[PDB]
């Protein structure tokens, strides 16, 4: 479109939010490249920031994300989706964990720690699924 180039600015791979939220995939699906964030979390940001999926995306500014830090940084007041998430209002804790790469799998398997120490299904056989199926 605009026949204008720039001076060393655009990259191709980023390192964002402690892992690789890349500079070729957007906010949305490079938060899917790291495990824990789906589509409509940052697509409800489209009705407040107008940033959809249609670009090669080494373009993001860290001050638009600060009005998304108005949506992110405290997980108790900031429009967390409630029919959406990976694990969400859990048996594990009870809150709607729209968490991140370092915080999904630590908040995922308290349903598999449980049931046949309790003599039923998931407290020896999932430990057998860790003493055998893990090595």
């Amino acid at each position: 479109s605009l026949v204008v180039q720039e001076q060393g600015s655009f990259q191709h791979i980023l390192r964002l939010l402690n892992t690789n939220v890349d500079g070729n995939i957007k906010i949305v699906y490079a938060l899917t490249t790291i495990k824990g964030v789906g589509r409509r979390y940052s697509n409800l940001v489209c009705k407040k920031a107008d940033v959809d999926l249609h670009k090669r995306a080494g373009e993001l500014t860290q001050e638009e994300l600060e009005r998304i830090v108005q949506i992110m940084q405290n997980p108790t007041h900031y429009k967390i989706p409630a029919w959406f998430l990976n694990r969400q209002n859990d048996i594990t804790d009870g809150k709607d964990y729209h968490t991140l790469a370092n915080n999904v799998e630590s908040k995922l398997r308290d349903d598999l720690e449980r049931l046949k120490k309790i003599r039923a299904h998931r407290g020896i056989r999932h430990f057998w699924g860790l003493r055998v199926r893990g090595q």
């Binding site: 003599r119 020896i124 057998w128 003493r131 055998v132």
Partner: protein
């Protein structure tokens, strides 16, 4: 020898001998039917 064998003197066209290699493992929890004993706490070493 009467108890130091695996197969009776039927060699002389019949059996391949069925070996029962006893490698028992404990049955820790309470309540046992015919079935569930051998799949209680299998520490497969």
């Amino acid at each position: 020898e009467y108890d130091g064998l695996t197969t009776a003197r039927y060699d002389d066209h019949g059996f391949l001998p069925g070996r029962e290699q006893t490698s028992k493992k404990a049955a820790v929890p309470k309540g046992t039917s015919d079935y569930q004993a051998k799949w209680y706490l299998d520490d497969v070493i």
